Design a protein around this nucleic acid. Sequence first.
DNA 1: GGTTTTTGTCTGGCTTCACACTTGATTTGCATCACTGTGTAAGACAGGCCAG
Length: 30
Amino acid sequence: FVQTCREEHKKKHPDASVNFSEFSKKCSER
DNA sequence: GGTTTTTGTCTGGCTTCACACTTGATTTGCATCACTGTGTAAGACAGGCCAG
């Protein structure tokens, strides 16, 4: 799932390179 | 069902090779040479059963 989540968020966060720990937490929380 | 494991996910900044291009003198790869001895089998041949 995590790849798809991050791919969707590529536009959600306009140009940010997101953290590993926090992105894990977010994909986890959904 | 809980309790245990495998195997993924997301980045980048890292380390470690391969490739890039040239020249010409080495080094390798590979097929070939000339050549007889040896096995195999295509011949020839004397031989002996038997009939006129």
